[PDB]
């Protein structure tokens, strides 16, 4: 699974997610990646999110939209919403993985509860940051 989120110079948010699924997958199984609000969500009012992990749990938890709703309705910061979803709610349902998120103010979060998540991010005209493992 791969994904991208961005905030542009016009203040617009967007998200995209793409996957091959899982090695040895049951043909016809669908994970969170192609499902709006599960693996991919963007709304200028809140956040752009792309997910990667246990597809079934990210669907059941509507992980991408849940970030947006916790911020918009719950008043949580991006960091608080990401901690709640990735480190508390998804593990409580037996889910493993992470996501990337940018809010309309340009805050960025790359939470994950796994050993690794291939990831990178950068502000326009700055040096990017890359990572594989936990800090």
């Amino acid at each position: 699974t791969v994904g991208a989120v961005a905030l542009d110079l016009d203040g617009n948010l967007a998200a995209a997610t793409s996957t091959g699924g899982t090695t040895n997958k049951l043909p016809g199984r669908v994970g969170d990646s192609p499902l709006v609000g599960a693996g991919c969500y963007a709304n200028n009012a809140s956040v752009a999110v792309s997910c990667t992990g246990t597809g079934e749990v990210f669907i059941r938890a509507l992980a991408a939209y849940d970030i947006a709703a916790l911020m918009d309705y719950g008043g949580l910061s991006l960091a608080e919403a990401c901690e709640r979803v990735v480190m508390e709610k998804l593990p409580a349902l037996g889910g493993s993985g992470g996501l990337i998120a940018i809010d309309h103010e340009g805050n960025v979060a790359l939470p994950f509860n796994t050993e690794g998540m291939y990831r990178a991010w950068g502000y326009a005209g700055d040096t990017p940051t890359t990572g594989i493992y936990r800090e």
Binding site: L9, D10, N43, T52, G106, G122
Partner: protein, 158 residues
């Protein structure tokens, strides 16, 4: 705030004991090249939608990541690909699931969003929608890599 991009190439049990630094640097180099392309597009005033589309197209093209070229194998040694794209300005979205003959699922997802009234298309119907609009039909085997085939053989032993 400032224009900004983030990308990912998947979360899971990425084991450092089993990797060399040179092996890790191939992933770091690929991630850095793609995020730098996105940063330069944002700096040039390109739309967030075009930036995430291009970043995911490049992650699809990159054999190291499980999307497009380098997709994992199903139980039946096939590839089944899925993608989504969403515009936070219009709240329009496009998605495809279960496609095997489209090189770049994220571009097929964008085509659903822009060239139909729909959000989600699946399987042969999704493929036929894309082909009817000039998107190329590709050999289902273009995505296959030795590394992912070896991972299927290992999965079959567990």
């Amino acid at each position: 705030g400032k224009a900004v991009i983030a990308i990912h190439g998947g979360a899971g049990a990425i084991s450092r004991a089993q990797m060399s630094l040179q092996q890790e640097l191939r992933y770091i180099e690929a991630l850095s090249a793609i995020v730098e392309t996105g940063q330069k597009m944002l700096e040039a005033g390109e739309s967030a939608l075009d930036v995430v589309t291009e970043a995911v197209r490049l992650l699809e093209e990159c054999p190291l990541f499980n999307a497009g070229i380098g997709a994992v194998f199903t139980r039946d040694e096939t590839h089944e690909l899925d993608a989504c794209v969403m515009d936070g300005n219009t709240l329009k979205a496009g998605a495809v699931a279960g496609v095997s003959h489209l090189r770049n699922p994220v571009l097929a997802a964008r085509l659903v969003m822009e060239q139909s009234p729909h959000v989600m298309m699946i399987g042969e119907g999704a493929e036929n929608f894309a082909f009817a609009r000039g998107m190329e039909r590709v050999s289902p085997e273009i995505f296959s890599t030795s590394l992912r085939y070896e991972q299927l053989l290992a999965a079959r032993k567990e």
